[PDB]
Short mmCIF file of N, CA and C in Angstrom, two decimals:
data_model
loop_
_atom_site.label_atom_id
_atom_site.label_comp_id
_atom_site.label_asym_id
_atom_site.label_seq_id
_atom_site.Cartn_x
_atom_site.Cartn_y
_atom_site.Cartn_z
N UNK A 1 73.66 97.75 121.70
CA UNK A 1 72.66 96.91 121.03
C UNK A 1 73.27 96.22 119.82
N UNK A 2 73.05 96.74 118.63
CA UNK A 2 73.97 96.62 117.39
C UNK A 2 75.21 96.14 117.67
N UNK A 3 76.30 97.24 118.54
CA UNK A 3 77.61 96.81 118.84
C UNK A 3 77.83 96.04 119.42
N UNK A 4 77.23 95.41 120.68
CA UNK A 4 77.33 94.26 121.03
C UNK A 4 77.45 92.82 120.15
N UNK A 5 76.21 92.77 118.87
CA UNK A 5 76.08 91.93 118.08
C UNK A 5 77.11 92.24 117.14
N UNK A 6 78.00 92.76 116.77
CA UNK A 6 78.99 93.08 115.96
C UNK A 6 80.36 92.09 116.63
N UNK A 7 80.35 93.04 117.99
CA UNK A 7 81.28 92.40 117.94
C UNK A 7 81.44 91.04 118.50
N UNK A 8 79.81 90.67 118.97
CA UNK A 8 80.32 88.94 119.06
C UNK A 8 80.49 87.82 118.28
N UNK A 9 79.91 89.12 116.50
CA UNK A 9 80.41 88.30 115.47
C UNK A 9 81.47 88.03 115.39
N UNK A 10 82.33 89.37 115.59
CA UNK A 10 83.89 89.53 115.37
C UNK A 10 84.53 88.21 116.08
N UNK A 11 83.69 87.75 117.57
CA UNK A 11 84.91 86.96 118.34
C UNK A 11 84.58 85.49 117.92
N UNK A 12 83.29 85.14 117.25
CA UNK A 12 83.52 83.73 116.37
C UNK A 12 84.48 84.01 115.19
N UNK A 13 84.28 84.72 114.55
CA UNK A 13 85.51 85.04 113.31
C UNK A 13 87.00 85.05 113.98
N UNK A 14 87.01 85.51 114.56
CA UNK A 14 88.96 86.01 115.68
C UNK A 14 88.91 84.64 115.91
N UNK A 15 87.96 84.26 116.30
CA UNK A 15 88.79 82.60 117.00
C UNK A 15 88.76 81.45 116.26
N UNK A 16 87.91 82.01 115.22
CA UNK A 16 88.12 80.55 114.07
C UNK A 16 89.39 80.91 113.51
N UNK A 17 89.77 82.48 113.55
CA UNK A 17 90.82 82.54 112.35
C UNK A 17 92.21 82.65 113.35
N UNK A 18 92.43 82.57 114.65
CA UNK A 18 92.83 81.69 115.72
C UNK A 18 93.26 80.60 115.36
N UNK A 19 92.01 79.75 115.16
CA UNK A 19 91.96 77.93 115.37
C UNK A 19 92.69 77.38 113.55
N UNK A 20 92.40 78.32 112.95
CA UNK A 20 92.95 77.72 111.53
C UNK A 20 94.45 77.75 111.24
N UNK A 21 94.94 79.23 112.20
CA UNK A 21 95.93 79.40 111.34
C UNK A 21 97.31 79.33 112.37
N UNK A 22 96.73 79.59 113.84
CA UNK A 22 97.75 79.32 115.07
C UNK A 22 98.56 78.23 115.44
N UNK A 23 97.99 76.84 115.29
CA UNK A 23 99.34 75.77 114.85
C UNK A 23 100.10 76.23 113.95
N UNK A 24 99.65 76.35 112.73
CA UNK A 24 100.25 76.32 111.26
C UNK A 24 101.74 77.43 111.18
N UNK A 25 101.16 78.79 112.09
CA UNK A 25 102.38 79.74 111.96
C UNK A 25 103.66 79.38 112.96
N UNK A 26 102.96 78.62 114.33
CA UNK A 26 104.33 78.00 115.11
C UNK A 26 104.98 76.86 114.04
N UNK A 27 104.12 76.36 113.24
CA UNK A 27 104.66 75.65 112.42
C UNK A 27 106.07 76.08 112.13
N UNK A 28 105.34 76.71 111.31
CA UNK A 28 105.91 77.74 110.32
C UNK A 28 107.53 78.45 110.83
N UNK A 29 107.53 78.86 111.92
CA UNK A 29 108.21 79.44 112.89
C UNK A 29 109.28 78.11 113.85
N UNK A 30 108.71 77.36 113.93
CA UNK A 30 109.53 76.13 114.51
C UNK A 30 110.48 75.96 113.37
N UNK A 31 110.26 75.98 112.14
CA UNK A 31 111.43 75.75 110.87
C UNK A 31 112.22 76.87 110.36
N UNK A 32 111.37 78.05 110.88
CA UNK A 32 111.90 79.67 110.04
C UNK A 32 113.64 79.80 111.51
N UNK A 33 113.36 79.74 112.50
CA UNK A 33 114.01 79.82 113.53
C UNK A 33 114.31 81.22 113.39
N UNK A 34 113.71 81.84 113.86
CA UNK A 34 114.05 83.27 114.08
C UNK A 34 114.66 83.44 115.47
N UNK A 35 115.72 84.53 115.29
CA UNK A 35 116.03 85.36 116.43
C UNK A 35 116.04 86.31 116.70
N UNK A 36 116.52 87.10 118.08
CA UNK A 36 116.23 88.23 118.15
C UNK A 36 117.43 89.02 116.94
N UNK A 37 118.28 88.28 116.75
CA UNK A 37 119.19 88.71 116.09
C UNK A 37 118.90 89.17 114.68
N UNK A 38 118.22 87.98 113.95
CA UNK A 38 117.79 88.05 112.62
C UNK A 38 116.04 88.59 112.68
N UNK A 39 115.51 88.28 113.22
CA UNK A 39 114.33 88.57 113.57
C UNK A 39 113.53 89.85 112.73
N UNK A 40 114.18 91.03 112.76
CA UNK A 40 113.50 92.11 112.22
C UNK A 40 113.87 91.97 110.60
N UNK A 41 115.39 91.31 110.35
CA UNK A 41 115.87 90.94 108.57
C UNK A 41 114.76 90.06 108.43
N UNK A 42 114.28 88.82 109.17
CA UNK A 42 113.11 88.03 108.30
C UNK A 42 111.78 88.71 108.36
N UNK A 43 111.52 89.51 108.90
CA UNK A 43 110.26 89.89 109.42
C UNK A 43 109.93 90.64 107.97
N UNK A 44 111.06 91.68 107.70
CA UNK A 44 110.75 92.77 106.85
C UNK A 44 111.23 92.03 105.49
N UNK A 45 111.75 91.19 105.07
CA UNK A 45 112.04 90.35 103.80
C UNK A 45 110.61 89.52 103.94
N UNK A 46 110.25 88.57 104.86
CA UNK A 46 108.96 88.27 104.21
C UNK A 46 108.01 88.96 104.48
N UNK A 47 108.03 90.51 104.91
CA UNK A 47 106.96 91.19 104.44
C UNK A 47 107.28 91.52 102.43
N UNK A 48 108.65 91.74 102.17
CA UNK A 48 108.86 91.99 101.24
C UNK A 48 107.85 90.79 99.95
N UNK A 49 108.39 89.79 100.36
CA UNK A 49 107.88 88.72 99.63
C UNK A 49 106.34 88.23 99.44
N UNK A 50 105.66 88.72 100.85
CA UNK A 50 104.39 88.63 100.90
C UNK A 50 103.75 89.75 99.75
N UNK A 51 104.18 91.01 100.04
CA UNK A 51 103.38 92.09 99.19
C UNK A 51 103.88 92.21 97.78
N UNK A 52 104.45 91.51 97.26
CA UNK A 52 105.27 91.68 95.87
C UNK A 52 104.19 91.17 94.81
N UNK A 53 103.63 90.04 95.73
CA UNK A 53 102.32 89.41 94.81
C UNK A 53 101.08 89.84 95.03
N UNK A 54 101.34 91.41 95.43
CA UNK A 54 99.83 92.06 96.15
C UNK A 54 99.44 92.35 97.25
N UNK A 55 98.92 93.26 97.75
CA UNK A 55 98.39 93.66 98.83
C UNK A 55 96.58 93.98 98.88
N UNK A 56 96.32 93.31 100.12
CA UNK A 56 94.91 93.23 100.63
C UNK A 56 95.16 93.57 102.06
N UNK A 57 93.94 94.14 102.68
CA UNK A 57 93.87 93.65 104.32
C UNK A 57 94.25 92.81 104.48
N UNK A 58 93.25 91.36 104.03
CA UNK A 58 94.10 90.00 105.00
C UNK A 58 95.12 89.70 105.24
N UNK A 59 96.15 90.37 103.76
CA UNK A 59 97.78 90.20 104.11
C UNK A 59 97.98 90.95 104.65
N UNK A 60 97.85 91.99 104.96
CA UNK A 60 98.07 92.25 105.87
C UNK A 60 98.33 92.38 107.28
N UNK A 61 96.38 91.83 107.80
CA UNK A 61 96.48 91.22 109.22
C UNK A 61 97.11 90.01 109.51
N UNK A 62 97.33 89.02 108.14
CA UNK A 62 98.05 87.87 108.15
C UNK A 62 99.73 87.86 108.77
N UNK A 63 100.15 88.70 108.16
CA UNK A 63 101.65 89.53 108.24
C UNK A 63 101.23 89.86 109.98
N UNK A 64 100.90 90.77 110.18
CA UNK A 64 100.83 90.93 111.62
C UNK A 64 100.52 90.29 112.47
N UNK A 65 99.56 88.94 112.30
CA UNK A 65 99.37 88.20 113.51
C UNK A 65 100.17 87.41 113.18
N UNK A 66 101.29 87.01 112.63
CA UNK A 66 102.42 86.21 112.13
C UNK A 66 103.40 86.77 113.07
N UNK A 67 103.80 88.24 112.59
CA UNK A 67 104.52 88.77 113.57
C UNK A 67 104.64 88.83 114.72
N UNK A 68 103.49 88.85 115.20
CA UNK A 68 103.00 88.81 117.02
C UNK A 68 103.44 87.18 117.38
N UNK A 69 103.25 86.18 116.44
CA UNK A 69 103.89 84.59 116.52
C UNK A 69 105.49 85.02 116.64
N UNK A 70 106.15 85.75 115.70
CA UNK A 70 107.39 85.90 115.53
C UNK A 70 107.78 86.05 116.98
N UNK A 71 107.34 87.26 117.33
CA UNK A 71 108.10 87.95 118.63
C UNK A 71 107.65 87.18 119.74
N UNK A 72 106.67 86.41 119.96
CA UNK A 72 106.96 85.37 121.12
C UNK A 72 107.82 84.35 120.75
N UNK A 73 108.08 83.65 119.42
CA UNK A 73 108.90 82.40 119.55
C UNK A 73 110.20 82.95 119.40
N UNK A 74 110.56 84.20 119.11
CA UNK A 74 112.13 84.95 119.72
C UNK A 74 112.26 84.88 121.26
N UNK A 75 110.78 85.17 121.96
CA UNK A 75 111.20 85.09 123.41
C UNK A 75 110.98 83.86 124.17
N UNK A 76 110.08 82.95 123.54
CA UNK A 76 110.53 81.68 123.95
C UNK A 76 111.34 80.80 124.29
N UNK A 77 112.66 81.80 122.89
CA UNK A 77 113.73 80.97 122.73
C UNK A 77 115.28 81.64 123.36
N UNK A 78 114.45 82.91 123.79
CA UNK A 78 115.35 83.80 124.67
C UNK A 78 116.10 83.34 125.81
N UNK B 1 116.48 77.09 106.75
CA UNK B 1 115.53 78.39 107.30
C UNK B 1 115.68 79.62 106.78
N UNK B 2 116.91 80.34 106.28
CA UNK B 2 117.23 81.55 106.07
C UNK B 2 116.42 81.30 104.32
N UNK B 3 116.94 80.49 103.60
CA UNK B 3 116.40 80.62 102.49
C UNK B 3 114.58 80.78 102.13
N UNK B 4 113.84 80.08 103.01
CA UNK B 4 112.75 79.97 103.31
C UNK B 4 111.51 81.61 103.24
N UNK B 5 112.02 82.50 103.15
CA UNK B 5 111.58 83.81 103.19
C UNK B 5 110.78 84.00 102.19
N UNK B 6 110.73 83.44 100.97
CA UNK B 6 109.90 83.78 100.04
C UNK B 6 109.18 82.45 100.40
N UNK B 7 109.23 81.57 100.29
CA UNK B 7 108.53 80.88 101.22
C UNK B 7 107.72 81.18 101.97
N UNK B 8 107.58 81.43 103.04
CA UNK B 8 107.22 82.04 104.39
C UNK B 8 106.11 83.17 103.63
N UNK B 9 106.72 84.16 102.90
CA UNK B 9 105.81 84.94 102.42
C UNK B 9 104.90 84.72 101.49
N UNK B 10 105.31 83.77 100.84
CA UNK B 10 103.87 82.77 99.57
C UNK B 10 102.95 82.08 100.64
N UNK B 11 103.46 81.78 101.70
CA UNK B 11 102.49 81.26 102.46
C UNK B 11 101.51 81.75 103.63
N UNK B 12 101.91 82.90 103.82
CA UNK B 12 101.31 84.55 104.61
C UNK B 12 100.49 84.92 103.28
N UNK B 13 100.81 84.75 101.94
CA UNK B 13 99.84 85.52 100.81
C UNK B 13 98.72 84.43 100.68
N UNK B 14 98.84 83.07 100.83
CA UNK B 14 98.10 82.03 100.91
C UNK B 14 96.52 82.24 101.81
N UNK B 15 97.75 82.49 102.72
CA UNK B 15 96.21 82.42 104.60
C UNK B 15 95.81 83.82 104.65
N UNK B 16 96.87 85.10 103.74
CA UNK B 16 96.10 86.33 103.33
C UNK B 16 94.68 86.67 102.54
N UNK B 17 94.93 85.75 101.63
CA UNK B 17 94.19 85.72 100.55
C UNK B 17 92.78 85.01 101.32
N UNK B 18 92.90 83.61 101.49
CA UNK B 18 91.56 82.95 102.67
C UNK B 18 91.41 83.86 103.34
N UNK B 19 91.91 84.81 104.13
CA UNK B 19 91.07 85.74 105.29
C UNK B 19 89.81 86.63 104.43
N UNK B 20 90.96 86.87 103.46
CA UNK B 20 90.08 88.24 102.49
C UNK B 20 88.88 87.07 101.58
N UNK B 21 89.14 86.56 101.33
CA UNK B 21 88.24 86.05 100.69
C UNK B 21 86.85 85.52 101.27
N UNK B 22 87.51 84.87 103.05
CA UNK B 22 86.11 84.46 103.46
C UNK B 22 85.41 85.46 104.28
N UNK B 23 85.97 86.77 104.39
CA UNK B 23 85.26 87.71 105.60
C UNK B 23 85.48 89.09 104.99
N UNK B 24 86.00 89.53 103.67
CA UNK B 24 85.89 90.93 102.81
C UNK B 24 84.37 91.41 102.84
N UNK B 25 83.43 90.35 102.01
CA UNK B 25 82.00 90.48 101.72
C UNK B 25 81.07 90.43 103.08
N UNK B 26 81.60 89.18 103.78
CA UNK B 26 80.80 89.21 105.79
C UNK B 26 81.19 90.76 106.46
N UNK B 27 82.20 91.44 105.95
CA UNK B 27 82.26 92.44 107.08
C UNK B 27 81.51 93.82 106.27
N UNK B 28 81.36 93.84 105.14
CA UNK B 28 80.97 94.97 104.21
C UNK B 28 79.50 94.77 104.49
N UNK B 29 78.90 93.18 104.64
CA UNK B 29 77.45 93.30 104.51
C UNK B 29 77.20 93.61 105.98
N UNK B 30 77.59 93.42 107.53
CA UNK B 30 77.45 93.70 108.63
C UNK B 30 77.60 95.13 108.63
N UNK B 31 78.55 95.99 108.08
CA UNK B 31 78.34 97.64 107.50
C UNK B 31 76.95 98.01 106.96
N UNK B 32 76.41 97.35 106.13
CA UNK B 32 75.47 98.29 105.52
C UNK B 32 74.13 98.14 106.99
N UNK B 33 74.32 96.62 107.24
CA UNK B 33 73.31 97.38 108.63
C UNK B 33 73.93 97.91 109.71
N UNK B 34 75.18 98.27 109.95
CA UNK B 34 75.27 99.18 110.89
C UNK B 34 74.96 100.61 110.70
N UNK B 35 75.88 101.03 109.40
CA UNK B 35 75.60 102.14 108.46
C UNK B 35 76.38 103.57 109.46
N UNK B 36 77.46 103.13 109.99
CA UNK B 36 78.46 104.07 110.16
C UNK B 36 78.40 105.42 109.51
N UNK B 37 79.15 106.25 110.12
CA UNK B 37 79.51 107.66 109.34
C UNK B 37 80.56 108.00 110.23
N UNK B 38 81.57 109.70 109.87
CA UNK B 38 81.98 109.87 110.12
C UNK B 38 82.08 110.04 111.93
N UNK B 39 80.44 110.67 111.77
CA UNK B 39 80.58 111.09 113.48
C UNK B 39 79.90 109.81 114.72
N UNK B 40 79.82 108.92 113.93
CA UNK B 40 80.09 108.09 115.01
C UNK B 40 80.95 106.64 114.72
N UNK B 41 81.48 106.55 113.76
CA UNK B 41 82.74 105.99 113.76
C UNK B 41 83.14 105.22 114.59
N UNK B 42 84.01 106.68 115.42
CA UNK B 42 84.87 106.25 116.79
C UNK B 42 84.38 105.56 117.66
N UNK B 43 82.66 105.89 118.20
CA UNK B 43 82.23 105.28 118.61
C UNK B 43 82.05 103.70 118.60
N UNK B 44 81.81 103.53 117.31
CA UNK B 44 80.74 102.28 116.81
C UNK B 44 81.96 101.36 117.00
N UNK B 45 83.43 102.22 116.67
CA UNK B 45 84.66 100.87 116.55
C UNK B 45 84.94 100.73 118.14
N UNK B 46 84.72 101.91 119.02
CA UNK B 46 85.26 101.15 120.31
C UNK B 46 84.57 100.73 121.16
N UNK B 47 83.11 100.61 120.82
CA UNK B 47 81.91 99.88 121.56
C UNK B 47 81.88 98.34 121.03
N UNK B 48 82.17 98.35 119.40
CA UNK B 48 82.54 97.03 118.88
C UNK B 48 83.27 95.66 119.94
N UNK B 49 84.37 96.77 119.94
CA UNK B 49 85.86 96.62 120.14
C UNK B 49 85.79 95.75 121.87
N UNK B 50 85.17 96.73 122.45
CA UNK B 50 84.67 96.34 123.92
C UNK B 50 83.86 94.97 124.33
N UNK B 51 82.83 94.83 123.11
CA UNK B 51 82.18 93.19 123.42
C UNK B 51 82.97 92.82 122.77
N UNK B 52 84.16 92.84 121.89
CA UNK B 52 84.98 91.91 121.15
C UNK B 52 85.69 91.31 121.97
N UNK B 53 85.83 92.03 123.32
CA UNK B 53 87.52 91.64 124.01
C UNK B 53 86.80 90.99 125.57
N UNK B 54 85.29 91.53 125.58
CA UNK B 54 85.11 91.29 126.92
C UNK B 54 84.59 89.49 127.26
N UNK B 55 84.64 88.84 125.95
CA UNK B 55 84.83 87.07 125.95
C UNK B 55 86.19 86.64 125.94
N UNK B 56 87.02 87.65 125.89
CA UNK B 56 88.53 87.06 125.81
C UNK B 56 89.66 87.74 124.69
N UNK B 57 90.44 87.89 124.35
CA UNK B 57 91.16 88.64 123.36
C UNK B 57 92.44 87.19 123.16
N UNK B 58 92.70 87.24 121.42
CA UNK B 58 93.77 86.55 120.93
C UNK B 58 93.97 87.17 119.86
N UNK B 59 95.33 86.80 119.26
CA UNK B 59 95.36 87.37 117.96
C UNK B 59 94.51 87.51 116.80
N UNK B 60 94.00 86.41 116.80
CA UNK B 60 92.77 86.59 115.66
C UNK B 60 91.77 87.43 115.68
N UNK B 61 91.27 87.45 117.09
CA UNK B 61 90.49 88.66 117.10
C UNK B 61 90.62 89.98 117.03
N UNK B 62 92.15 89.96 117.72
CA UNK B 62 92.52 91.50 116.79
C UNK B 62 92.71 91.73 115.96
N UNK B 63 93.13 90.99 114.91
CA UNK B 63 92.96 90.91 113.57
C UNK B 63 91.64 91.12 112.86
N UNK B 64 90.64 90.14 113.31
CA UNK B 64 89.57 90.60 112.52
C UNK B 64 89.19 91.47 113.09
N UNK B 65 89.45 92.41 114.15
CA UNK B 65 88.95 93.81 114.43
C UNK B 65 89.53 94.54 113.83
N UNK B 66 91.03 94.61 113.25
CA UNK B 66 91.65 95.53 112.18
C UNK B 66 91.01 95.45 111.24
N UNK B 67 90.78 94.08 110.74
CA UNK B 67 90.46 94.45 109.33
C UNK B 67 88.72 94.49 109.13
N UNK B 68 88.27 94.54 110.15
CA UNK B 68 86.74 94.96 110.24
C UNK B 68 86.80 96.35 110.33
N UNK B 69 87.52 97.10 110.94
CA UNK B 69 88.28 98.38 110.90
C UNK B 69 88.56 99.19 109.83
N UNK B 70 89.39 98.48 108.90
CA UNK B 70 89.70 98.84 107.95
C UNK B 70 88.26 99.14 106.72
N UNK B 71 87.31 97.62 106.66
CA UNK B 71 86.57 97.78 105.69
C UNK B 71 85.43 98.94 106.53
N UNK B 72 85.69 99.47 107.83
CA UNK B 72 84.11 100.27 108.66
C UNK B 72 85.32 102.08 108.16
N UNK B 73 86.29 101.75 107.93
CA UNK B 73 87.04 102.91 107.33
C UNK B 73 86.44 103.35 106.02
N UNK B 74 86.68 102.60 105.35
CA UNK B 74 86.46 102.65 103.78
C UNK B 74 84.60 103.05 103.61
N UNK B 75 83.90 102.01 104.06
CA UNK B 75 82.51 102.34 104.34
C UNK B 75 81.96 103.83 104.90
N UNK B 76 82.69 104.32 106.32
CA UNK B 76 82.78 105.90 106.08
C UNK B 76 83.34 106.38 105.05
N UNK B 77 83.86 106.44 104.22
CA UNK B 77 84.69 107.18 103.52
C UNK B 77 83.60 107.37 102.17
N UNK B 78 83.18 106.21 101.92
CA UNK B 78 82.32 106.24 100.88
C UNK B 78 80.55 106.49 101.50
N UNK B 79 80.08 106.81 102.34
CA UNK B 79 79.08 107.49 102.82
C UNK B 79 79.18 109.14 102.50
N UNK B 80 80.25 109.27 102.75
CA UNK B 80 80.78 110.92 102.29
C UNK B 80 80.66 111.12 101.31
N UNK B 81 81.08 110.61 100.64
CA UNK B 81 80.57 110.63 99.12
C UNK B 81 79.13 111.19 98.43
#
């Protein structure tokens, strides 16, 4: 009942925050050029850089759905 | 590109900060009417979790299921109280 309405809030929120930020990180990633090589050194340096100015959830989930961008455009480019 | 890292991470603290800012208060006030506790928790997150995924699953949505997660964590935690 409830949970249902929860979480079909959740999937307008997931997909707006999808639609805002999913160009922007291939962006992001088309210029960072990660590899599998360097890949885990940038991953964990800009986690470094992200949390230096603070930590919240969102940076958090930000950091991670970044990462999940990371590791497909390593295998994209595989 | 290599130099770009602090970069990269001012700009993850950027679209960090907008997440928290536009859905911290939306997911705390959807808590008080769910009104979680410890013993059904587990439940409430994987019944959530289930209409979350059964329109489709992308990153964002697992995301805002973590961090809907996170604040239905904290919300038990402070019911105990």
């Amino acid at each position: 009942s409830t949970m249902g309405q929860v979480g079909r809030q959740l999937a307008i929120i997931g997909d707006d925050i999808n639609r805002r930020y999913d160009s922007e990180f291939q962006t992001m990633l088309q210029h960072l050029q990660p590899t599998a090589e360097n890949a885990y050194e940038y991953f964990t340096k800009i986690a470094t850089s992200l949390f230096e100015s603070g930590i919240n959830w969102g940076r958090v989930v930000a950091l991670l759905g970044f990462g999940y961008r990371l590791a497909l455009h390593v295998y994209q480019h595989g």
